[PDB]
């Protein structure tokens, strides 16, 4: 019913625990299997290197047929992530499929950290800097990672 969602989330949790990705980690916040916390590790060779970014994840009651709600709780300087921690990733909206898993979602966000999408930006002002002065962008992103992510 929603017992169905729970069954699926337990399954994803078991899969994660068996072999978790190196660049991210996730599990229930407390005793509510619908409410998870995640860490995304700043990628190597990025201005986010060394950062640990915390995310909130809420699974809907008819998972896996709607996507999870996922937002950054750590501040991050990125053209595809806004001040609400809201994340611009198609798989979190129109492109979700019950085939996908939470690990796939976090790996997509790791990948987004490595490779921003400045031509279809959530935050135009950051994309502008990314596109015209990548060095300043790396400066500011590094500074935020030091302020907020360690």
């Amino acid at each position: 019913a929603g017992s169905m969602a729970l069954k699926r989330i337990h399954k994803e949790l078991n899969d994660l625990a068996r072999d978790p990705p190196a660049q991210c980690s996730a599990g229930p916040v407390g005793d509510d299997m619908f409410h998870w916390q995640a860490t995304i590790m700043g990628p190597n060779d990025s201005p986010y290197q060394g950062g640990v970014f915390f995310l909130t994840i809420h699974f809907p009651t008819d998972y896996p047929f709607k996507p999870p709600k996922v937002a950054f709780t750590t501040r991050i300087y990125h053209p595809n992530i806004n001040s609400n921690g809201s994340i611009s990733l198609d798989i979190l909206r129109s492109q979700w499929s019950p085939a996908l898993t939470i690990s796939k979602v976090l790996l997509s966000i790791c990948s987004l950290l490595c490779d921003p999408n400045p031509d279809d930006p959530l935050v135009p002002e950051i994309a502008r800097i990314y596109k015209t002065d990548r060095e300043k962008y790396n400066r500011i992103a590094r500074e935020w990672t030091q302020k907020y992510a360690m």
Partner: protein
């Protein structure tokens, strides 16, 4: 019991530990085989940064569990 520790160097080390080991104990052991100062170490399991005084068993870390090891940025 054995546990794995994954890094952002993708690399995986194994540790022999007890459920009663504290997180500072685990960091001590990582210093032993990798030479990383405990104070540089952030240990993460199931989406949580692990607290130094807690035991493995407080986090339900069991045999064959995998932790993530993340190094703080530190100057010379």
């Amino acid at each position: 019991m054995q546990i794995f520790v994954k890094t952002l160097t993708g690399k995986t080390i194994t540790l022999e530990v007890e459920p009663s080991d504290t997180i500072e104990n685990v960091k001590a052991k990582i210093q032993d085989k990798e030479g990383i100062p405990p104070d540089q170490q952030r240990l993460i399991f199931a989406g949580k940064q692990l607290e130094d005084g807690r035991t493995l068993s407080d986090y339900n870390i069991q045999k064959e569990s995998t932790l993530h090891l993340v190094l703080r940025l530190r100057g010379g």
